[model samples]
Target chain A: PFTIDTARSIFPETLAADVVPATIARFKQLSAEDQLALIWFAYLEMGKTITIAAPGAANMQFAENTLQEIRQMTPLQQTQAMCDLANRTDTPICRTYASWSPNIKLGFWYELGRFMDQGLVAPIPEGYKLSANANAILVTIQGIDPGQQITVLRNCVVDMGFDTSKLGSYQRVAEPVVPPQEMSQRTKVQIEGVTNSTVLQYMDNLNANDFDNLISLFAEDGALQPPFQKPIVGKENTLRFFREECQNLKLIPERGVSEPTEDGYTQIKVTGKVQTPWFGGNVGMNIAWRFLLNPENKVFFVAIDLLASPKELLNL
Target chain B: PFTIDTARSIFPETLAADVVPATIARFKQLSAEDQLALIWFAYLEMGKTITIAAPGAANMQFAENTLQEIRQMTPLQQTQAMCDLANRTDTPICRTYASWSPNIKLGFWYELGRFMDQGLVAPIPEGYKLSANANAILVTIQGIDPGQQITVLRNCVVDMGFDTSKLGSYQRVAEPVVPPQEMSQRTKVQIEGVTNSTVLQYMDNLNANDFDNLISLFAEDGALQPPFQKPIVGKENTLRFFREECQNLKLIPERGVSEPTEDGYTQIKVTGKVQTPWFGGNVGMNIAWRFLLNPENKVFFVAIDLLASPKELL
Candidate 1:
């Protein structure tokens, strides 16, 4: 397999320095052209992913742009470009910091290129290469244990230097979202005597019976993830749940799903809710459920990506 | 610590070549030097060990000579020389077979110089600048398991363009004898074991009783790696292991240990035997044990690196 030495040697000199700490810092700060060199260097070394802390909004923006560009490159071209970046001793970061100067960068990059040149890429990063499945698993675990919710987001956002709390500390990012534009005006209809009728608050209670089959008004198997296991599914799942699950549910509609996935999966974040079967009623949390689902018209596996039963709901 | 990126990048150019069935035949006709260059190229990029259908002796000897030459230089110089030997395309294979072509030979030397100019004189190889602890950990992991043993030595042998069966495998090239006069004597006393007296064997056996107590033999608060725990501290702990936990057990040695860090203490490696009390004493196994001692004559730690026990023994 491509050994670490050769991978770094064949890379551009600047990219070669990435295998060390000093340069990694400055590299993380470079423009898209240079950042890519670092990323691909890691990949040519056959690492699964190159993790870089963006440190700010600009970094995040740059990351998005660079990765998107890379997302379009062929694997070979991507690798070669990566090599050029690291191997170029004149990389912005390399020139800026003398400590980042790596004498072996060229040799290491060449070595890496040779391995690739010779067709010997390793299967995974030499150390800990996290898998997609693991990410999904963490989301599930956080739902089961609300306390760990922040950590899940922290791992994803700190690289950008943004505070984890800003990413919606109370909600998980990338949750599924509701379909755009409700099919019927009945999506927010309410009882005449009911106290709450805010549009956002009303979507919280749209039941098939109450809204006259309003929820089914959207796509089949459409779901609402309100931070609880018993997600409201379809118009029926949504209506019956209005009383059965959310009899005393309460929420601050001002705070809705935060960040949706690239695929548009919104999290029906549960702001507040309680269940009291013995007393027959408990305000605030009679029904609270959140489901991050596959927007496709199927309910068999519309798994809930986030569920919350916070010990105490904080006012937004 | 060397990150994952550094560890993955070190293999050579030939490693990327597609080895078709016909390629093997073509590979054989090349001169030894050409073969060495290609093999060295692969070895360098290989960075770690591989599991190839073994290629035996002739190449292993070439590798030995090359490595011996490499050892004389500092890490930086060694890295440079290797880089020159692997990547200097104009000369191919160090121009070893090109004595008939001075043009190719000069090209080779010129490129070799380029490698030095790039960085070979630096303190450490680029991706390999590791902290002492990281280095220790890497060495300790060597031969600790099937995967590790294989990773550390893959393609390390120089290929003599022959089949594995024709040449003995290079699993652990027998330590090269540094001097000839002491060859016979050393062979009898160490290597060959021709005259290893039954008395000495018996004595070695006796030493097994207090394998842990031998920590006293360590320089001082040394480390013990009996192939169980990577490192266990001080003679006190070592003695406890012998007196309370190990003396009553049985063992056999397999993997040998090196005392590369002896300036600070002493090192000893003992392998073989397992810890099994339930299988009628016959359930012993083969393993690797290493010890690093302190100046105070106590063990700093003891490590149990490998285990060759059966599934049931575990």
Candidate 2:
């Protein structure tokens, strides 16, 4: 018997980090029909564990009408209703999905999976396989803590299929997407002559505030030991940590030395100024960059340590 | 985020014991088609734990053909094939189902469930529900430990959809079904004073050797405390024990005392000769019967402590 842990760990262990969050972002932006279709595929693929994870199947009982509506819908309207729910479009079906609690929301998909398992709802066509990107996303969803993965998903689905009338709140964080890297004169240090494309791309992506692309420059099992924080290992964890911790930070590379180690890895160090609101104003602190590059040239490890004294850095 | 434990415990907690076993027995005798249909419904009702209990879905990859066959099957062929598999009817599908390990057999239904979830296989009709008996069996299935419940199910499903032809096996135990008891009694002594109909009928059913009716005479949560073994509780459990332990035993009642338990239960005792092969062969031994009857008149408890000493009984 393959234990639950073994079934979940089945994945391309070397998949890049961006594939996960990128897919999460991509899922939200997909055409509504596509979102609905993808959601259907997800539940179908999840086979067996349908009811196991559904703590709210009881609440889902309240959405019996939604299920009935899907039952009678023309496959087209079913698709449309699914899209509405995915987009939180506030149609009657979507509103019903919205009114349900998160666990019930989990049950909503599970019930459909049951319906689909029974071959009632839109059954997956024969030999159906999700697209590579979508499948990788699914694997990524499985890669994390079972409970946390659900946490990430609940956030995505919670806002779907709901109507919102109140607009008094004006607060919002800047979107996670990084605009193209167009910088000002204060970043005058020329980023020329960095022969290692991986390192050069790393510098460019950091300056561009591109966390996804920046994290991709690291190896699949790469480690990023950030300042004053625990080591962030692997692409997904690294990307996740980057999104929250370096949202407004920018890196300015100044000088570097690349040397080969006896163990077949390249040792590269680039000193750079750290720019962000953290230092009271535009602070010029030289952060010692330590890079461990594997023979494949991907950044195997990196440490962002500042040369400046902590006393002086924090005092100012 | 329904915890895993909460989801499995869903069912009528107070359902009768016989309904479950009766349904289980009834399932085995179903036309292959009905058994398969019931299996399908059971899985569908269990939605969400597809992979949770699937400790062997990895092995199911081997039966991709079985899955593929079900997929390619026409609605009519699909039903026929399911019937075939359930009956272990030597067809390709049934043989394939039988050859797989139990967990993978679990995965087999699960994958089809996935296919059905996607609306690919024969979809469950909209607003479908299992019949009362089938649903009650499902509830009984749910009431036990999740692991032990699977143990019982694995046994039920293990022999399904397989081909077995061995002619040399001439030996077999008697079937669990009880033959109608018809014994010309040794006691022509005149029957007179057992006025409590419940007690009289209890003796009658015991003498008739009908385990089901005798157990049914007890309360739903009744206990049967036998000598030398742990007390068996509830109808299902009591029947289960009786089927094994009392298969060749008979009670010949001789006397009784019916007194009210101050707590309102009626305490009844009947002395009898236990006719059984246990003491060598048809060994005559006196036994004391202790029974506690509920206010509703159903037997709440029973203790079968023989009057003979252990050495003498043995």
Candidate 3:
């Protein structure tokens, strides 16, 4: 009596006769982002039941090396690498991710989502809504039996982290729900160089008025020390400060240098000209920014000041 | 340099050296719910960084026997057990919880908050706001160094599950910020009996128009197979059904009989009288409900049918 198949069905052989195809047929109709988004929402919505139903399935640890690498990555790198795995790109991380046990992958994505919700990893773009197509994918997932749910969940998550080598080859057979046609990657903007990545990432967000990502660069207790102003402490306050005083500011980096501080923060100093409503263009500004980053390369503290003397500062 | 103490400060030894006392003093000012809610928010807000900063501290698994016991419990029992842990009641579960490593306890609360967010395992009451006092607790936690953060976190979570006994205890020292007076248990109304738990929980939520919990009992993929009407499938649709057609209806459960249905679903048949605005008063109803439950004891399939003959019905 358990046998039934709908567009939302996962494994038709377990609960199907000619029904499973239409499920994937519908699944292939979505874009890669929508497909991944569908899986994400499914994991978010009913993953608890899945965990309770199949703890034995996820009892093992994540590949420790991969877990540590992700733990150590900057938030931007982590998000990019995750998207790479979701899109099944042949990047090093995605290839390594494929070697992981589906158990590890499932747990990894589960933690990734946990990270996203806490504003740790790059959050789903604020106010982002899932597509109707994505909702259909969700319905399909929630409709399946518990065991089937794990396989589908595992398959969705199996390729999500960096793995250098497979020791015991615990990787499970991936029961793909849809063809690869719709799983192709959307090209990503490459973020390169340690100094450039940090400085330019800050600049890009600042210029774009992306306050959330801007504040996300800060550590949870990160401090922002602005010249001639009281410093701000913590991500919460930093976020609010951006939306208020820091709005509409622009920084174009000329050159920079970075070195490890004795206290363990990676400190980078950059000289840049800035633009703002109050100061207008150029202003012959020789401004300096000292960025101190935490282990995750998130800003722990930053002190912004001018290198220009008063006579030179007023010359422009 | 981290030694500054305020009402929100925790462990002064690691990050404090009066600093920590004021933190717990403010913590003691809260009701048990507020204290737990504060920890809940702190867990919610910065747990990612804590996990990142101190993965070694949380490498251990939750005590599996305890986890399995909680997993097997009905949702009502699970929530009550969690609350028992939160309030530090000297119950079986709380005692078991105290035996777990601070590591295991921290992970448990982290997952608990995750479950609470998912509309699983009883969510925080809809639209419930935390107190200002709770916000202060959050600040105190986020202000600390990561090591101190983990310690404060572990202490808050160390007493949250059941354990029968312990050997080779890996339990870490609990550097509790607050003393026990403010942590006393709020009196609880006990829910007893299997059939009574299921039937009464449904009745209580239904009577209170708790559309959310009423819907939560249904499995995510659960079906409501109402007689003479098309069955409603899935929690999403079932929730909408409650807010619409089922609104303001009251169920008075008189008795029930449950047995395992061979297909692996626990089937319970409840005979209850129900009232509605249309019916006005005690509608002497012979309504029979066939409740099919899942492994987690959430309703999987429920069919509401009239056991009354036409003469009895009319």
Candidate 4:
């Protein structure tokens, strides 16, 4: 009789042949059960197809469907499916299966074959059913088109023991699918010494009156401390401060000394002469700008100091 | 006939009878070649023992010896050992073995059993023969005692095809094992605003005349830039500057403001009244100290600017 014992006999012969043609020839000579077992082996372990002709066209389709289902399962689900197929009588197969390295997924078709052999079907749990209204909402939630949504809904309905054939043509009012919004990527800049690209970009943005790009260079909760003035906290406040300062002032930045500080901050000692319509005369300002950066290389804290008279800050 | 095919038929029976006693009963009834094959399977794959017993008491010892020899090899050498035992006739075993997961290691006894079935002996490599002096040196290199050394040396000599039974006493001059040197851990300080533990510790070290600990707080290639003075760089130069400054002056540290900058440097605005014996009177100084830190949190760049007069610096 074609049995598990008959299946065991083919491994040595199959192993010995080495060449594909002879291996398939040996595979063809096996009984149906043995052929199924070899097919399971080829699917699970070899990850390749064998040349042996299918016993039946339907069986071949079943094999392909079972393989696809198993491949789609998560590791944990695959293990559960394997456990469902296992029993005391097939301890050798069980032991051999267990002896292999831990796999998140074993081929689904192989487990399906064993499940069929054992005359068992997976149990359906409660809450698997959905109302028409809920199903429509779920399709939108999944962001799938109405056509793909109906196919799965039909599959679910059939799996839930429903006779969809008796029901007339199903139709529903279509709702437009709205895609979710995506967050903008945070800007990251590289630093080498104190002449970091981000720092230079900050200066360029200041000169170009690009306040938005300048604000983007800072962390969302960044702070700015101006010498002889109140500290400006948060991005909005910092933006407001820059707008007010840049509006009236004319700044000519000199060749500054940029160096790395004791912590991960960068220091730019800028000596520049500034004139504004608010000031009576141009003032020569000796200024130091300290910038503290976060891990993403975005400036999080900016502290500015004027080494000149406090009157210069008042004028500008 | 007790061929490999005849042996292959028994796998189903053994696999079907999963219980050890039933497996042994089936094993006891098999031919010698089949028994050997089952034994190989039991020992290697199943990890179970059968009561059919070893083929012979001496052959059992030989089996154990062969298993041990293969077990001691590195993974690559074991793969080489498998290759050495292989032939066209044993392609089934080779194919099955290869098809198993890419195990850096397989049960050596299983491969040994397969090798024996093919009637092969492992070839001794040329490096297996080490001179007496070289063997003694190897033992010292392995850093084992004289007793353990002899056991391995005897195994090596026999493995090299030497007659250990006729050999007399083994002796060697002892060599001391040299141990590796230890590396010292670096010190880092925690900071909250300007009240940095490291900066406080630096002050304490200065007041306590612990110059070495103060210097240790800075990185090896640290820089110190003081107001109205040439910048001091490197450990020796910074140490010299601190020593000269600490010698004549006494610092009374007042409260300071410490703030973090955007580029991850700390700004310390320290106000202190300095008392120098060389100066005619005390000088009140407001100072801004900028500190840059390395990954280890040790201060690397320390730039100090005096907000007061040059007389305060002088």
Which model scores highest in TM-score?
A: 1
lDDT of each: 0.32, 0.53, 0.51, 0.38
lDDT per residue, candidate 4, B1-314, as tens digits?
A: 12111111211211110111212222222222223333333233222221112132322332354455656766555544443322111332232232221110122333454555554434323233332222323333234322222222222211221112322332211112112112132232333344676677765565555667779988886777654233477889787666544432345555555555434544444444444332214223344454555545566666554332222221
lDDT of 3 by residue, B223-244 (tens): 7754333357778877656654
Best-to-worst order by TM-score is 1, 2, 3, 4
Tell me the tens digit of each residue's lDDT in model 4 across A1-316.
2111111121110111011121222222222223333333323332222111112232233234444564576655644444333211133323233222111012223345455445443422223333222232233324432222222222221121112233344222111212212223323233333366666677656645567777899888677765433357688978766654443234444444455544454444443434332221423334445455555567666655443232222222
Q: For every candidate structure, what is the RMSD over all alpha carbons to the true structure, in angstroms?
A: 27.8, 23.7, 24.7, 39.4
- Per-residue C-alpha lDDT of model 3 across residues A112-230, encoded as one tens digit per residue: 66667776666666544555445645676687544334435543454344443333343432222211112133221222223446556676776666677677787776777554233
TM-score of each: 0.24, 0.23, 0.23, 0.19
Model 2 over residues B15-34: C-alpha lDDT tens digits?
Answer: 11122222344355333433
What are the per-residue Cα lDDT tens digits for candidate 1 across A1-316?
2222221211111111001121222233232333433333333432222121112232233233433443466766555445344343343322222121121222223343444444553212334332222222323433332222222222221232112222222222211122333456534433222332232434443422234333433345454433212234465655444433333222322232322333543323323333222112222222222223233422211221221233222211
- Candidate 2: lDDT over CA atoms? 0.53
lDDT, residue B260, candidate 2:
76
Task: List where candidate 4 sits over 4 angstroms from the true fold.
Answer: A1-316, B1-193, B262-265, B309-314
- Show where candidate 1 strays beyond 4 Å: A1-316, B1-215, B218-220, B226-230, B241-244, B254-267, B293-301, B307-314
Candidate 1: TM-score of chain A is 0.24
| Model 2, span A1-316: residue lDDT tens | 2211111111111111122232355354333444555555554443333224343333556667778879887866765666567656548776556555544565577677677678677764566444333444455555543222333354466557665434333222222344545655223234433467787777666666677778878888687765322357788978766654454456667656677765577767666566642231324444656677877888777766534232322211
Better of 3 and 4 by lDDT: 3
Sorted by lDDT (best first), the order is: 2, 3, 4, 1
Winning model by lDDT: 2
